[PDB]
């Protein structure tokens, strides 16, 4: 029911498709979408806007985001491993 539900999809299929696979569309952020979204991650109905990054982190509280690096920390140091050395969305 949480934004921490809804962003770890986000992020970890993002993360298991850059990975050891596809870095060249996060580059170019919205080919990195629509591969994503083709998974069968969905959201509110619909398909992923870039937009609701806005619905994205102000939704988010302390709690939220301890949390989100506690329960898969694994994932936090995935992403922020290639967030240094890669590119910086």
């Known amino acids: 029911n949480k934004n921490i539900d809804t962003v770890r999809e986000i992020i ?7 990975k050891f696979s596809r870095e060249d569309i996060v580059e170019n952020r919205a080919n990195f979408i629509a591969f994503l979204n083709e998974i069968g991650v969905t959201h ?3 398909k992923l806007n870039q937009n609701s990054f806005r619905k994205i ?13 506690d329960e898969f920390n694994e994932g936090f140091e995935g992403v922020y ?7 910086n969305k």
């Open 81 to 87: 491993r290639y967030l240094e050395m890669y590119t």
């Open 12 to 18: 970890t299929v993002a993360s298991i498709l850059i």
């Open 44 to 46: 509110e109905g619909r």
């Open 57 to 69: 982190v102000s939704e988010l509280t302390q709690e939220d985001k301890k949390t989100l690096i």
